[PDB]
């Protein structure tokens, strides 16, 4: 049985190298799709009619978010020791149903767990910096989710947190270069908290260990808000490296797959080390890197088929939009999204970003 993997520098599924082509959901009910009987009651038709309308449009994959800031899941006891991915244990269930929704048409499933654009709840923030308490996270509700779900085909790959630089206190100066922030001095990180670089690696590094333990072929990502933390080139710095979060966390075997920048524009101009102005090689990553967010409204006015065309030409290994719920700022529409989503449909460039119209089967 095949899943999706990364050699040589590019994502392969099966023999082939493989582009992720497709949307952020990147939630129905923000923080409650998943746990305590929602799924079921609530948003599962939702989510599934996601599924169906992204690949009837040409997609192959999907983002979507889990616990988010904590105010719903995982399940906290009066200590703040966590007891089950929710009060009802449907969770891993619910997620099921959807892997199972995903796997009949032949749509790649990406799972976040944790936001850092939103300030967490105490609970959260407190296994950040709680080991303690972080080990029972691991222990009573991912390591048996991801185990149990460890079979299912549609399941591209797990992310511990979005990204993370929204709760980093950035322009911070350390003797450890993995842990001084003063590459991100003036970028607006840490809008939403200001916790040292290294708990959040740390944090990310010994969930992505718990995660490869549990399931020791399934890949994890990362999704950084721009550009400057995945990267050592343009004078900035990549935060996710193999050797950063091991020096972090202590784990070797916490370690990423695939890198992901998000991009947009920041009073009508992107960047000019936007990952949508740049080439994936000018980065010069020792993994492949995903564009996991962008939008034509948060753009500078390129169409969005301009956006999702670039990714799948100058060497990225997927492109996901934002987002399919339509909400918020800077989410597009989903018609505007499915723009894009057709633009690749059909493509097969084995030189370029690879092939868009997978078959899990």
């Not at 409650?32 to 989510?47: H, K």
């Not at 222990?139 to 048996?144: H, M, N, S, Y």
């Amino acid at each position: 049985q095949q899943f999706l993997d990364v050699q040589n520098g590019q994502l392969r599924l099966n023999g082939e190298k493989v582009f992720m082509s497709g949307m952020n959901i990147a939630w129905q009910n923000y923080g409650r799709d998943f746990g305590n009987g929602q799924y079921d009651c609530c948003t599962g038709n939702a989510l599934e009619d996601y599924i169906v309308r992204i690949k009837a449009e040409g997609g192959n994959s999907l983002r979507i978010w889990v616990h988010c800031d904590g105010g719903y899941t995982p399940e906290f006891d009066g200590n703040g020791y966590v007891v089950g991915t929710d009060a009802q244990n449907t969770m891993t269930s619910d997620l099921a149903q959807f892997l199972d929704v995903a796997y009949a048409n032949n749509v790649l499933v990406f799972i976040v767990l944790w936001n850092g654009a939103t300030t967490p709840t105490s609970r959260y923030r407190d296994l950040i910096y709680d080991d303690s308490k972080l080990q029972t996270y691991i222990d009573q509700a991912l390591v048996p989710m991801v185990s149990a779900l460890s079979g299912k085909v549609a399941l591209g790959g797990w992310e511990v947190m979005n990204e993370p630089e929204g709760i980093v206190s950035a322009g911070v100066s350390d003797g450890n270069p993995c842990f001084d922030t003063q590459p991100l001095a003036g970028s607006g990180a840490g809008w939403a908290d200001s916790i040292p670089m290294q708990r959040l690696q740390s944090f990310i590094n010994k969930q992505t260990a718990a995660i490869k333990r549990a399931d020791p072929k399934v890949i994890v990502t990362l999704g950084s808000w721009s550009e400057r933390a995945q990267t050592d080139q343009f004078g900035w710095r990549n935060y996710y490296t193999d050797n950063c979060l091991i020096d972090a966390g202590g784990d070797s075997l916490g370690v990423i797959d695939f890198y992901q920048m998000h991009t947009y524009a920041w009073e009508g101009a992107y960047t000019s080390s936007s990952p949508l102005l740049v080439p994936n090689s000018q980065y010069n990553l020792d993994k492949p890197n995903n564009i996991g967010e962008f939008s034509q409204s948060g753009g500078d006015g390129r169409s969005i088929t301009d956006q999702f065309d670039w990714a799948y030409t100058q060497g990225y290994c997927g492109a996901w939009s934002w987002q399919a719920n339509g909400g918020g700022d800077n989410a597009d529409s989903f018609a505007t999204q499915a723009q894009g989503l057709n633009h690749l449909r059909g493509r097969n460039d084995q030189n370029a970003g690879g092939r868009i119209d997978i078959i899990l089967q």
